[PDB]
Symmetry: D2
Subunit: 64 residues, 4 copies
């Protein structure tokens, strides 16, 4: 299925059993890749090639 490991304020990582909504990894054995530099606190949809995962990042940081 789909697996997400590291959800930060800035990133989310995905792992599939290679090419998000509020890139291309040409393998060869790269089962995973990590998106970088996105907006904290946002809902998302991720799909890899069915099937999709929904993600929310986390506000806030530095500082308040």
């Amino acid at each position: 299925n789909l697996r997400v490991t590291d959800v930060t304020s800035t990133s989310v990582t995905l792992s599939w059993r290679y090419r998000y909504r509020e890139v291309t990894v040409p393998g060869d054995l790269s089962h995973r890749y990590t998106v970088t530099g996105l907006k904290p606190g946002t809902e998302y949809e991720f799909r890899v090639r069915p099937s999709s995962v929904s993600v929310t990042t986390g506000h806030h940081h530095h500082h308040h």
Copy 2:
């Protein structure tokens, strides 16, 4: 003067006193808990064991001003 270094689904990293032996970080959900990190050089601490998608409040005092963090969902 407190900074939130990293926010994860289950953890938070914090960075931030005169004649301080150690520091006590207190945190609560939206249940107060407190863990003290001894050492003046202990200027950072990572709080683990947090629930994903939950709002936390963090404050550190030497042994104002606090910060709020929401974990991933």
Copy 3:
């Protein structure tokens, strides 16, 4: 080769290996340069922790039921 070392620390190393067809999981075997093999079974990436800094280690991953050398970091004074 087919097995690569992504990150190396004084006390840990992370490894990634190509998937095998029709396999329920993998057994990673590692040893010191003495040395006696130790294996950890993970049902395709894993980080082996609890290692001694500044020493040469050997790692291999095996399909079940049927490679790479790593040196950790060294530093003074701390």
Copy 4:
């Protein structure tokens, strides 16, 4: 003024220091065993901490940090092999 190595990788080193108060900032100096000194300035004093990247795997490095103005010294060797 102790100087601490929090994390060491094949290509990077993490350092933390006491840092005398109040420093306008910090300068990190490093050199390989045979190589030349290189200097990086960190505007303090928020950060008693810094991560040095871009190092060669399996290399001897020497580090010392000075408050600015204008110390504590540490020696580091990184790990090998990676690749493959």
